[PDB]
Ligand binder design. Sequence first.
Ligand SMILES: CCS(=O)(=O)c1ccc([C@@H](NC(C)=O)C(=O)Nc2cc(-c3cc(C#N)cc(F)c3OC)cs2)cc1
Ligand code: NA
Lengths: 252, 12
Amino acid sequence: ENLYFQGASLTEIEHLVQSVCKSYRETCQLRLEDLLRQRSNIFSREEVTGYQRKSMWEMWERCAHHLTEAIQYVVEFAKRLSGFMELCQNDQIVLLKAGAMEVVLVRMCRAYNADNRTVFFEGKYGGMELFRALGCSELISSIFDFSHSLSALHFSEDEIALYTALVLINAHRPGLQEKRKVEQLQYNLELAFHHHLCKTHRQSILAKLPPKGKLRSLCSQHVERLQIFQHLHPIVVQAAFPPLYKELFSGG
Amino acid sequence: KHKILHRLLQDS
Ligand SMILES: CCS(=O)(=O)c1ccc([C@@H](NC(C)=O)C(=O)Nc2cc(-c3cc(C#N)cc(F)c3OC)cs2)cc1
Ligand code: NA
């Protein structure tokens, strides 16, 4: 079915590096240079107050829509990723359900400015105070902290491409039917990532990457805060949350 | 009972 479902040679690992970086370049959603350039476009105290005065449900709906848009690009990345479309549909869905949010969380560090602790949201850079109406400050600050720790790594676009491919191709996801096939694909992607770090003298980042448990906790907290919102505004979720968002985080 | 993922995966 796929070359990366068996033992890959060095030349084939080199080809995988190029492929993953290209699939990422084609589905990265926002270009890094556009995100970097807009860092000086910061929300005013008046604009921040405007977001803070928005209702909880309207802020939740806007964030769910923006998160859904980012997830759509991750689905495309997955689709272009070597071996992914050769896995069975159950496995494809398992991997995306568990991993899409995690890939989005990793990708978000590109949109985060560690210098002033702001993130790119709806055209400008705003701090965590921008999301006060949500009423989940512990989850917001934990996402900000995560983006802060990844930003400290000075990730290149190629590093993000290879690392997110690994976040997604995780043979430990509960419910995988063709586990060994995923295990082999993950191993080749690990080799691709580590080869690139070896080749660019960036192996020092290996011990600095977040523990796998960290992305899992962030995703679990999101699912939990969504259930609390769902109890308060059930018709909002049912009527105005994107269907893709509900399929992934509220069982349909 | 939404099923957007299979649609997205199937669309080419
Ligand atoms: C993720 C891919 S990319 O880096 O290309 C890229 C794409 C779009 C946006 C941006 N587009 C719009 C129109 O707004 C976008 O969607 N920005 C969001 C930020 C958060 C967000 C960021 C943190 C942190 N750090 C913490 C949070 F709690 C958050 O959600 C409350 C949610 S949506 C940002 C980045
Ligand atoms: Na950053």
